[PDB]
Amino acid sequence: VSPPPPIADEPLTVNTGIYLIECYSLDDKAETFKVNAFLSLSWKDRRLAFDPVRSGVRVKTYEPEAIWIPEIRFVNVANARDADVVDISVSPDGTVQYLERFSARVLSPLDFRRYPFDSQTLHIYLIVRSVDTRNIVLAVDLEKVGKNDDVFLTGWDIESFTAVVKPANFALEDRLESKLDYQLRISRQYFSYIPNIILPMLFILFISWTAFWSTSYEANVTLVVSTLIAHIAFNILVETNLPKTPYMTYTGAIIFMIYLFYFVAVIEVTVQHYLKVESQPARAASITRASRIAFPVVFLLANIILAFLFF
Amino acid sequence: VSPPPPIADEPLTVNTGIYLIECYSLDDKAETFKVNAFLSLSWKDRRLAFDPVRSGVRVKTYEPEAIWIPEIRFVNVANARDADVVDISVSPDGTVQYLERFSARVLSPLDFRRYPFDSQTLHIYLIVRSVDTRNIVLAVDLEKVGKNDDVFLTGWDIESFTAVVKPANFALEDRLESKLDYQLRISRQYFSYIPNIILPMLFILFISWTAFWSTSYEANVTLVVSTLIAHIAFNILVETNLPKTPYMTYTGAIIFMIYLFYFVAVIEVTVQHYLKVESQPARAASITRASRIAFPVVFLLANIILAFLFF
Amino acid sequence: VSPPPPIADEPLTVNTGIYLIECYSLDDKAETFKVNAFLSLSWKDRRLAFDPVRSGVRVKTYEPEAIWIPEIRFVNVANARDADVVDISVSPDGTVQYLERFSARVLSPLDFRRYPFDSQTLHIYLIVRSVDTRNIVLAVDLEKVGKNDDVFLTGWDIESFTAVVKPANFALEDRLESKLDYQLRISRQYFSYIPNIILPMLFILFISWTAFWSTSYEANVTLVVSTLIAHIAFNILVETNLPKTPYMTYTGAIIFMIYLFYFVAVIEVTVQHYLKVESQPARAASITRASRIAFPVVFLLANIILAFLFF
Amino acid sequence: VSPPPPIADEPLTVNTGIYLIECYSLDDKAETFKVNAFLSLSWKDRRLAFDPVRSGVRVKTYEPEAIWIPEIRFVNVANARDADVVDISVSPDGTVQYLERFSARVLSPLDFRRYPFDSQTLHIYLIVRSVDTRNIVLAVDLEKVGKNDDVFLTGWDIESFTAVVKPANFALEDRLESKLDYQLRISRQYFSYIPNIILPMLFILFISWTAFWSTSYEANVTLVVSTLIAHIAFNILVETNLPKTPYMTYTGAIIFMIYLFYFVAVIEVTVQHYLKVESQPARAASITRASRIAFPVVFLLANIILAFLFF
Amino acid sequence: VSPPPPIADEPLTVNTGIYLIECYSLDDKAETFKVNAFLSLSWKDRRLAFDPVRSGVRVKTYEPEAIWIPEIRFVNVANARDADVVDISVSPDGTVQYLERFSARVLSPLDFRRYPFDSQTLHIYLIVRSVDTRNIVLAVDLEKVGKNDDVFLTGWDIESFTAVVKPANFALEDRLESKLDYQLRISRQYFSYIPNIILPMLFILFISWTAFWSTSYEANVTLVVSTLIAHIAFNILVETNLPKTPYMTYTGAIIFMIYLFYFVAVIEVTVQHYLKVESQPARAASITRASRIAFPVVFLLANIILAFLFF
Ligand SMILES: [Cl-]
Ligand SMILES: [Cl-]
Ligand SMILES: [Cl-]
Ligand SMILES: [Cl-]
Ligand SMILES: [Cl-]
Ligand SMILES: [Cl-]
Ligand SMILES: [Cl-]
Ligand code: NA
Ligand code: NA
Ligand code: NA
Ligand code: NA
Ligand code: NA
Ligand code: NA
């Protein structure tokens, strides 16, 4: 079967639509997400046109093998989508209405700069390659683009599912390619990060600062060193849930900065002890009293600077 | 093959049933579970009807390709179910009795608010899309809905497997869809959480409280800081087995609250030492003696408040 | 093709056999194991019977499509088995001899009460569903039930592979079902648990008991608290290799009991220090001297009680 | 269908091309990467040649079954590629233009010597096995070799995708094999390693060196031993992300060398304490004062030597 | 299609060969490895014999369906191999030359006694089951047994790939089975274990021995207990990479023995402190001075004994 013959030198418009049924397994590290959706296709094939009076039927149902169907692919998929044809209906004017249900693992990169207070735009790229007989162009049928109400993505708020109506027409290996962009806007549910990572990390840091109210070097060493080890555990815990980025993330920035706070606290604890041994506790006391105000103030200001730079 | 022609303007009723054989791999983080079950289908096709006397046979067995079979799908599946037709029997009134054995990874969300003392309702949504010739409606044959006695779900008690008899008939992409809800009620076996997480977590917390019977700041610092690190390990252990929720879980609430108890214990340990150095041990003694009663009382009352709010 | 017509009202006996070739991947947490075996089937089809003199051949070889073959399934499988027909041989009397090689992931629950000194009975349930024309009953051909000598299951001793010769005949969805039970008896190789978990766990516990020969509260706090953290690591290590059980395991019981021993050791260490500060070291000495005998004696007796209750 | 008959004793040239669409899942430990690309093939089949005037058509489109297609395979793949034919076009002179879209898990070894400042050359080996009728040779059509702009590999910078135009023609099992080498040059994004591994590792090492400003053996023991445990955690973290190499990696060298620095710091801390107890603190002071300069100087010089040897 | 008819009562010899192309994913815990290789088969079918003069052709190429092909299987595979026929060539005398490219996950047990200085013999068992008409025997064509030069197994040195030329002919379910043994000899690249596990483990042990040059019980307790916890981390790290063995491994023996060294070091540290408190430091000094020589000497001798027993 050959594609529909053109009337004039016009290309064949294949109207598309994606209706999300299931959205799952957004792998942050792999920047992949799995989708289960309806893919609707519509085009005019004048060769399939019929008279409703003569034939008796209002619409004709065909099997995929029986008629010409456009070779529609996804750009950003790991493997070819798992699809099952639901219906093929032909109107008297030759307007074919195709519907299939598919599942695919979509590969869409994520921007972790504002993690875990980040928002993303997941993409689903529909593509058609033009044939030698005729050029094929994709279009969006806005009435057949949507999502089920029950569609949920664990740890994410699904904002919108829309399509960029004008396709990206380009040439690949001396043939026209018509690419459509389907955008699923999501925003992370940062809630859990607050009692699980952020507050426990702040608590251990604040515990290290109690060494500014102690003259016992042995106890101070235990305070700052133990809490630093807990901070290392939280840093390792955070980087397991995230991929290796060529940029600094919001959480990554905070975590890294906190290391400097532990390092300077060790220096303060060392200086205080050296001075006490040197029989200069008055100078040591001035440094410790200053540190009680300096450490929280510098921490608060540095965080304001970070939050400003990131948001 | 086209669907059965209607007598009047009535829709085609496809009687359904699901008999669970195997139930496994309930992934709490992924909110997925695997199922192996029998799917029974029954509908009337007057075109397949035949003579007992003339034909000789009581029932006719057909191969799936030979006759019209409704395109029955699952809504909440990752991929198309793995199915193998077991039997197709036609009565001579044209009543078709279809049976297939399938396996699928069902995507059903879970409510972790009361974890690990939570109960869930897993869903299996059966769906049929109406054709242009005729509208297809699903029905429940209660005699063909059940589960095997041997059906076990590791770490869960299987309560019931029932079906919501009235389908959710709606329009999707200008076509009628008949959706049925199959509900598998389960309840978590919380037993293991008590000797593995809850009691060990209480033991380390109670060990930190021994600092209220010690004047040794160095020993108290070691007691409260070490036990806090063990509590961090238990917090990390718990959040690995659970997904990131936009709400607080029962275990999550307790674990988070315990951090505040460690933080105030550090403050007490610090205050006590500062006062002793300041040659005010009488005031420090009053604070330590009060803490011996305050810490367990406030812990007990706060837990009563949490248990009340959650259950 | 229809099933063999009955002479009298007798059911069709399908003689079965399973010969294990490969046995692997016993997942303790998932209570699954993978199998690669031969499945032999034999039944009489009088319609396929022939004269050896007239036909010339002693046996006729058929392709699966050519003749009626019983729909044999496994009850406790995740998905339908991966099978490849090896041979189909028909004797002159119509006795069909079918052989296929299959692989499947069998779902069989395990009893962890005596872990790691536990033994299990893995099950493989063969099943046939009766047809409308005739009832099908399964039988065991003991000469075609066995296992290869090289069959090994990492960390397990394969004891026996036998079949319960009398089938469990029952009705499921108004049709007879003939179920056969194939039992693979295994026993865990507990050896590795001794130098890897049990002895290291005892060593750290015995190290904590050295605090009964020390008056240094600071050193005792470090001894009991550090060893308790190592015990937590061993508890976490053990529960990762095991699934969540609604009962107590042997190892689980020991591990949990050891927490109580650490808790009482902390109390002893606290009491001793409080008394010393109170200028009552004579009373503290009596308590410490008693603890030197009490702790190992109570530990030995409690373990005898546990071993008695569990074995 | 037999291959195209030769004019003279010349071999059949199959012009090839690979256009990368998706590049993902580079597993460092497994030395595997997944690819989704276009595979273009072109050869002359004089038997398929036609007159454009007589036939009417400029090009003829065939189904794969209809014509002879060369058996093209990948050398370094885990399993046979997942492919779907896109187009087969025959020119009047018999020049066949084949295009397929495929996905495969490519097995290409990596050189970790300079990790995480390493660059790699991933290989994709195309191969054709000669037939008895004729010898088949592969060629590169440089116009059909490329990559999509959006092609991204998490944690890597994609440098180039080129093909070694001259094939490696050799004999395997007494038949000619024509092998082509497609090279994907990548370079690691080392950025994240600096705030996540390198700096935290340096911070804990520098913290251990504060013991050179302390006379408190108990505090020094806590400083050097605790920081060493954190260094062990970083060593374990690094070797999980890497495979077992029969050579030393850059990061591996640094990490190993740092152990020696901790070991000598323990010796210094021990020597200092022994001398103080021996009532020789003047000699101990000379050793500690020297260590303050020796440790950072030897660390800086040793790192210069390592960086020189590795880069 | 039936097998080739015998001349005399001789069995049908199927000459085999395996040429390794890709060797990957050797899972130590699962005792599995993946293979991608060429499988060559050759047998004489007199029914396919032809005259080169009359037919014109020197060799005839057939499709697998057209002629009788022996049912060749692998014994030690997880699932049936993924195979794709490359060529089938028939010589005038009826000598068929079959070649296929396959991939399979081979299940071959490993001996960990000498780990990580162990060598293994991986097996690939080829098997053919005799038919009722004729008995089939396997043979090795040594000219078609080999491996590609580029064949690499991460963390292993590939020594040789040879075949045991004489098959293991036996009866299984009253039919002859001809089994061939293909052996891939490998030896572990132990290099990485030295700077990653062995030396760091020795360093922490040697650090614990510094307590023999200290009289500070509090510092000694910190030294021996902290290093013991690091040794536990290395023991856990080692047992994750290894399966549970009913025997002791070389590394397992060393690791276990080191626990005894830590235990006796705790006893020494305890005895020394008890004696000092008892105002007997002269006796304590004798014990500590002896331990300085005893501990390294006993460690060196015990390791010589272990190395002797294991190698
Ligand atoms: Cl696709
Ligand atoms: Cl363009
Ligand atoms: Cl074009
Ligand atoms: Cl489905
Ligand atoms: Cl099955
Ligand atoms: Cl391939
Ligand atoms: Cl096989
Ligand atoms: Na078509
Ligand atoms: Na059908
Ligand atoms: Na059949
Ligand atoms: Na072809
Ligand atoms: Na064949
Ligand atoms: Na300490």
Author numbering:
A (entry chain A), B (entry chain B), C (entry chain C), D (entry chain E), E (entry chain D): 5 to 315
Task: Provide passages from the article that reported this PDB entry.
At present, the best structurally characterized pLGIC is the G. violaceus ligand-gated ion channel (GLIC), of prokaryotic origin. Each subunit consists of an extracellular domain (ECD), predominantly in a β-sandwich fold, and a transmembrane domain (TMD) composed of four helices, labeled M1–M4. However, the GLIC is a pH-gated channel, activated by lowering the pH, with a maximal activation at pH 4 and a pH50 around 5. We instead found that proton activation is a complex multiple loci mechanism, with the key contribution stemming from the coupling interface between the extracellular and transmembrane domain, with E35 acting as a key proton-sensing residue.
In the lower part of the ECD, the principal (+) face also carries two acidic residues, E82 and D115. E82Q and D115N display significantly higher proton sensitivity than E82A and D115A, respectively. Assuming that Gln and Asn faithfully mimic protonated side chains of Glu and Asp, this would suggest that residues E82 and D115 are also proton sensors. To investigate this idea, the structures of E82Q and E82A were solved at pH 4. The E82A structure is similar to that of the Wt pH 4 structure, whereas that of E82Q shows a marked local reorganization of the Q82 moiety. A structural analysis was performed on E26Q, E26A, E35Q, E35A, E67A, E75A, E82Q, E82A, D86A, D88N, D88A, H127N, E181A, and H277Q mutants, by solving their structure at pH 4. All structures were in the apparently open conformation.
